Scaffold this active site. Structure first.
Site: not given
Ligand SMILES: */C=C/C(=O)N1CCC[C@@H](n2nc(-c3cccc4ccccc34)c3c(N)ncnc32)C1
Length: 300
Positions: A141, A145-146, A159
């Site tokens: 992932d 955003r991570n 994450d």
């Protein structure tokens, strides 16, 4: 197959204060907080993740997997676990990354981000990701955003919810997935490799170079698979010289072994970070006494 001797540290609820909520959503709830290891005479700015008050048995199994992985990493470009707290509601404690995630940061600061920053972030992420490749660990992932921001000069990969430790592939039951970041082999065959992470790296770089644009903004997720089969990719960002865009496109080869390796990606973006205005073209480049950051609080 070396034995994983990472220590999992267990924190008393008394040791740490919740100061304020940073966010809530699908994950649960995240708090800014302060941690005082007992007897130690330090204060450590932390973030605390509680589940959305869920008492669900599958939910506790989830964050303990995350805890597992976070506890097993040690790199300046990768987010590590500090501890867990076994309150009825299970809590993950990590370092406070004050500036939030990078996606939100590029958006909030579009008009003030120079080429030197962008290219350095790219380098730092490739380092984090290469560290994970060494540790035989597949992120699954990777996205803007991570990646969290300790300072604007220093970012860390995070994450590890979906993150899976390896031989040379991972096969999955669908659940939910971030389709727009995924390699083709992952969408079709649910296969995940380090080289599949490279695809996600490409898209992440693209998110940074467009200052937070949404990949395939128009398109519906169902559709993506077919498009990439056609041969369409993401567009060249306005700021990007062909040299940089070339590298993104190489991350998006159909044949995953033809994609670059993170170690190579470090090199390329490093060369570019040396003369950053050659590679990106942007208008206007030109009590707390006893506080200690987590990166200075080693324990063994
Ligand atoms: C843009 C990223 C974003 O929207 N959010 C939502 C707000 C909360 C943000 N956040 N998450 C963590 C974080 C990530 C992974 C694992 C853990 C574990 C324990 C505590 C927090 C986290 C954040 C951290 N560590 N610091 C500041 N903000 C954080 C992400």
């Amino acid at each position: 197959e070396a034995p994983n001797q990472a220590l999992l540290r267990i924190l008393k609820e008394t040791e740490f204060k919740k100061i304020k909520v940073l966010g809530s959503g699908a994950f649960g709830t995240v708090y800014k907080g302060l941690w005082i290891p007992e007897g130690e005479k330090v204060k450590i700015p932390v973030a605390i993740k509680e589940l959305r008050e869920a008492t669900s048995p599958k939910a506790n199994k989830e964050i303990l997997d995350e805890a597992y992985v976070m506890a097993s990493v040690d790199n300046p470009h990768v987010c590590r676990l500090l501890g867990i707290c076994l309150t009825s509601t299970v809590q993950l404690i990590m370092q406070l990354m004050p500036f939030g995630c990078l996606l939100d940061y590029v958006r909030e600061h579009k008009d003030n981000i120079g080429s030197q920053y962008l290219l350095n972030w790219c380098v730092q992420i490739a380092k984090g990701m290469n560290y994970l490749e060494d540790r035989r660990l597949v992120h699954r992932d990777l996205a803007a955003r991570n990646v969290l921001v300790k300072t604007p000069q220093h970012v860390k990969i995070t994450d590890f919810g979906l993150a899976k430790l390896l031989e040379k592939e991972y096969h999955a039951e669908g659940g939910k997935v971030p389709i727009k970041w995924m390699a083709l082999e992952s969408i079709l065959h649910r296969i995940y490799t380090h080289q599949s992470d490279v695809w996600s790296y490409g898209v992440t770089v693209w998110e940074l170079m467009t200052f937070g644009s949404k990949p395939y903004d128009g398109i519906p997720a169902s559709e993506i698979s077919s498009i990439l089969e056609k041969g369409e990719r993401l567009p060249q960002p306005p700021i990007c010289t062909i040299d940089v865009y070339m590298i993104m496109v190489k991350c998006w080869m159909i044949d995953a072994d033809s994609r670059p390796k993170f170690r190579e990606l470090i090199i390329e973006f490093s060369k570019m970070a040396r003369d950053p205005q050659r590679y990106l073209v942007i208008q206007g480049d030109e009590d707390m006494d006893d506080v200690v950051d987590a990166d200075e609080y080693l324990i063994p």
